[PDB]
Amino acid sequence: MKEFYLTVEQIGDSIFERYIDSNGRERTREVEYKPSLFAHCPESQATKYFDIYGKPCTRKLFANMRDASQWIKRMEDIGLEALGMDDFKLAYLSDTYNYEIKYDHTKIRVANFDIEVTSPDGFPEPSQAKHPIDAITHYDSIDDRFYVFDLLNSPYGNVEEWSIEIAAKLQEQGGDEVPSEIIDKIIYMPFDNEKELLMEYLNFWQQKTPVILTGWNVESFDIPYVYNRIKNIFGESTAKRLSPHRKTRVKVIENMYGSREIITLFGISVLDYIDLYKKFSFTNQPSYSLDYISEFELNVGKLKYDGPISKLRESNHQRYISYNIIDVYRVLQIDAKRQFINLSLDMGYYAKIQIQSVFSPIKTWDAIIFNSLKEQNKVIPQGRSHPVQPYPGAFVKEPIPNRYKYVMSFDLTSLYPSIIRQVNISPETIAGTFKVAPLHDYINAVAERPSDVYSCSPNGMMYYKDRDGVVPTEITKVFNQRKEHKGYMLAAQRNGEIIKEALHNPNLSVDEPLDVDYRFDFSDEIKEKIKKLSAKSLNEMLFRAQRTEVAGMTAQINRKALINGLAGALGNVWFRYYDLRNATAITTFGQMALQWIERKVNEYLNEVCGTEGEAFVLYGDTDSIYVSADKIIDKVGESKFRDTNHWVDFLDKFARERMEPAIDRGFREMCEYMNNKQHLMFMDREAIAGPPLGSKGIGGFWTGKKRYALNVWDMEGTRYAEPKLKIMGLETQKSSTPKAVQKALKECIRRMLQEGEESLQEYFKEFEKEFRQLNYISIASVSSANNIAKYDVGGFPGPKCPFHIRGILTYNRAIKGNIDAPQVVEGEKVYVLPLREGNPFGDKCIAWPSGTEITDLIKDDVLHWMDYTVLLEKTFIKPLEGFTSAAKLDYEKKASLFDMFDFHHH
Ligand SMILES: Nc1nc2c(ncn2[C@@H]2O[C@H](CO)[C@@H](O)[C@H]2O)c(=O)[nH]1
């Protein structure tokens, strides 16, 4: 019992919904929905309905949605406000599910799939779909099975069936190491020709139509490709059968380069995992290849193979198919730990939106706010359009490029959401303006107090302190829910430990697992019952506690993305509640908060250390400040510390008992200055960084805004056993930096921070020596092949032609005629190497497709003519020089008067 929806669409005058009924069965209904909208109505009938400003309204109820749209359009032409939920899907969901949705995830068909398409050049265009689909793995969550569709005959090669028994063997028995926990879950179907396979897959899709559809890049490649492929071979009518409502929209997306095609399948919610990860991971990443993220998430990765992916089928079909399966599995494993599908499902059902709408803060919040106001008989405002006007962003301090021995950092809790609550910023809490001074005047508390009666932002805006506001209200709701679910997750952690206690030597009874709520700390009587409990039952309880812990995590990450979504939405001109004044209010208040507390921290540390106008805050970014503790350490005396932990202890205690109290005083004052609704500027200690005691390491350094390294010992009270390097914007991770130089540069930084100049100097000479010995692939830089056609004049480079594009040209010249070498494609990644003067390739560099060897035809000639000197200079030394000059060290020992002497020592 308790129905929930699966997907909803509007097609003309009916709502097409897929849903789970009271019985638990998946059904489909078509509803000729009758929307309601609102007009302002001079209160001649004692009305229940008011807009967010308190103006009375009247309800108009329409025969069909099409009429409703006409009306809006009519109303707007006249100049009148068309109030209410103009997205009827949302209105429908709100009416039909006018309760808190409880959903059973096991009844939701979640498909995870990937395809393979062999093409002579290896990068086949989804819009054109010239090439046969020769492998599909489709995982179904309800069946818990991997359906594998294998093409045996292609124009590009014919192959034997894949072997499940070979797939299961270890690498050294010539196997693929497809895990046992899925080996038995594979249903393998080979096909003699593509038409067979596609027809079977399409029939398969009708029987098991995905509600939620996902995978890696399914939106930009896999879905468009199968759709076009089917359309091409069978016709559009057939391809449309991929939508349960037989409706389809093809959308063309022109990015910063060419274009791309996206297919909307009506009645299906596509949540591409790559986007799901980008949104919910809250971790910046140098690459978003499934291979890299698996590696990051699961400490392993995608299957490995000899040669280009475009040659894998012909050379190793066995691996080809296993690799495809594994790819689908990797996503499942990431989801196993990250839980982004369930998060999307929570959020979707929490807001009452199409599930794919979780990608859109403005859509989600539009819905959340609509439902909230609906329970109060309040009416939402018509959305009017606004110009895209650039307004202030975050404050980033320009740092003095230098080494910084001891650094301590602090950041504000959840800054923009905190500002919204503190100032009381909402479209309807606006109370007026004040004559505004330069921002620096407020930072310095020199400008006059804006208002004695209203809550103010340094941009000139005033807000009511007494009145509520939709934005601040809705946000504080989610804030509390976050605190609440966080609490559950923690209690489920502590309870899990209690159960892990009893598991070390439990009773040999025949009993059952206790029926308890894991979201709450166990009572003493429960703790006692647990001791005298069997291993069978305790293991069931530990599983239960951890399912609850996971639920807590997910629910509170949900609230986190929700909270930050709103903050971002208010800056988005497409948001029903957007207002430039309110967006500037938020960000300008931000900048003041950061520079004000910078001033206070400088004032405090000068007083406390007895120094004149000293710069303690060396850097800040958006919500965090970076404090040089060098003077604090001197004032004590460095030699007074017993070990590294001793000074880290000291800086912690100093942060806790001295700086934070001061910071809080500082922000309380700021709050009074702006006369805000409540004090919510909470800053506390983040990191403590420095060199190990009695080393010659430099601790950290900045080279510029967003470019710095720190040797971190402690993060928010947790002490690391090994110190952790925090590196930012230093090209240690850019795909462009060659793999070996990436490791090398990080080692240079590690030694700088931890060990000092001499260590760095010894490692530099060492790496320089080992350089000419490294695999050529590990030392090539990586670029993107963009606009090759543009700079291709006959066969030679053109005007102002990029270094890497020139390389691609010389490669294609050198492999021309011969049709047996891996070709370079537009919008693909390429390795690049410099060539020495007067080489047979007639240019100073060459480039080939990444993840491939150079073809044998020319490999050794290339390698022989490589310009290591230019290579090491451009990729390694230049970057390093940037670091060393900023830190004021030398990576090569400066000449000495002693150099010429043969000593026994150092
Ligand atoms: N309270 C409220 N109801 C709305 C609004 N927009 C559309 N409606 C619809 O009008 C009806 C109110 O009883 C419901 O069917 C709602 O789905 C709105 O802005 N506020």
Short mmCIF file of N, CA and C in Angstrom, two decimals, residues 4-6 20 103-110 141-142 211-212 345 349:
data_model
loop_
_atom_site.label_atom_id
_atom_site.label_comp_id
_atom_site.label_asym_id
_atom_site.label_seq_id
_atom_site.Cartn_x
_atom_site.Cartn_y
_atom_site.Cartn_z
N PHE A 4 3.34 5.33 -5.05
CA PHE A 4 4.27 6.38 -5.46
C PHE A 4 4.43 6.39 -6.98
N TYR A 5 4.88 7.52 -7.51
CA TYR A 5 5.04 7.65 -8.95
C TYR A 5 6.42 7.18 -9.37
N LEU A 6 6.55 6.83 -10.65
CA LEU A 6 7.84 6.43 -11.20
C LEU A 6 8.35 7.51 -12.14
N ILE A 20 3.76 2.87 -9.08
CA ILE A 20 3.58 1.66 -8.30
C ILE A 20 2.29 1.81 -7.50
N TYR A 103 8.60 5.31 -0.42
CA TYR A 103 8.84 4.52 -1.62
C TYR A 103 9.66 3.27 -1.35
N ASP A 104 9.35 2.22 -2.09
CA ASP A 104 10.08 0.97 -2.02
C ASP A 104 11.02 0.88 -3.21
N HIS A 105 12.31 1.10 -2.95
CA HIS A 105 13.32 1.12 -4.00
C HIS A 105 13.41 -0.19 -4.79
N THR A 106 13.06 -1.31 -4.16
CA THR A 106 13.16 -2.64 -4.80
C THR A 106 12.14 -2.83 -5.91
N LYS A 107 11.15 -1.94 -5.97
CA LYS A 107 10.13 -1.98 -7.02
C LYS A 107 10.46 -1.01 -8.17
N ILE A 108 11.56 -0.26 -8.02
CA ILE A 108 11.98 0.69 -9.04
C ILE A 108 13.04 0.08 -9.96
N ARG A 109 12.68 -0.08 -11.23
CA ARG A 109 13.61 -0.66 -12.19
C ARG A 109 14.71 0.33 -12.56
N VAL A 110 15.91 0.07 -12.04
CA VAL A 110 17.08 0.89 -12.28
C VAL A 110 17.99 0.12 -13.22
N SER A 141 18.15 -3.89 -12.11
CA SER A 141 18.18 -3.95 -10.65
C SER A 141 17.12 -4.88 -10.04
N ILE A 142 15.97 -4.99 -10.70
CA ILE A 142 14.91 -5.90 -10.26
C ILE A 142 15.29 -7.38 -10.46
N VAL A 211 12.88 2.37 -15.41
CA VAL A 211 12.35 3.60 -14.82
C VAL A 211 13.51 4.58 -14.71
N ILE A 212 14.55 4.16 -14.01
CA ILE A 212 15.76 4.93 -13.92
C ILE A 212 16.82 4.27 -14.74
N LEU A 345 16.69 9.53 -5.56
CA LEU A 345 15.34 9.05 -5.27
C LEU A 345 14.73 9.69 -4.04
N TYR A 349 11.61 12.38 -4.50
CA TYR A 349 10.39 12.13 -3.76
C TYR A 349 10.13 13.16 -2.64
#
